[PDB]
């Protein structure tokens with residue numbers, strides 16, 4: 089493999105990656121996301137979690153099948169790290185995939201946060217989630233490519249004109265803002 093090792097330096101990244109703006113994070117294409125969902129890697133990948141970092145109204149308007157909605161850092165931390173999601177075989181992998189609407193801000197932010205927390209609760213260099221990816225282009229790019237991998241088959245942007253109140257309501261539940 090022509091890249092660096094995963095975060096606990098145990099092995100190479102399994103998935104092919106594409107360029108993304110956060111140069112130190114690994115991005116995957118919609119096609120690769122589908123390869124996971126269709127079990128192309130089932131001999132090796134025991135579990136993968138799709139972490140939809142968008143707000144609940146966005147998720148409710150259409151999300152990737154099997155995805156979990158964890159927009160608040162405190163909830164992502166509880167869900168992922170209170171009782172870590174472990175493979176059922178020592179030989180097999182657990183992978184996290186983070187995304188948001190464009191995977192420009194919210195997805196990458198959550199990915200970095202989880203790494204920070206994972207490091208904090210382990211003896212270096214061990215990690216619960218050494219292998220994490222960002223879905224390039226987020227839900228906005230995924231839905232038009234693979235609508236039957238989504239439910240409902242629709243797309244509700246964060247800035248949807250009918251959801252301005254819902255955006256504000258959610259923001260007021262966050263731990264920090266500028």
Ligand SMILES: N#Cc1ccc(O)cc1F
Pocket residue numbers: 095112113114199200201203204220
């Ligand atoms: N932060 C962070 C972080 C998350 C995943 C990764 O592969 C590398 C990183 F620096």
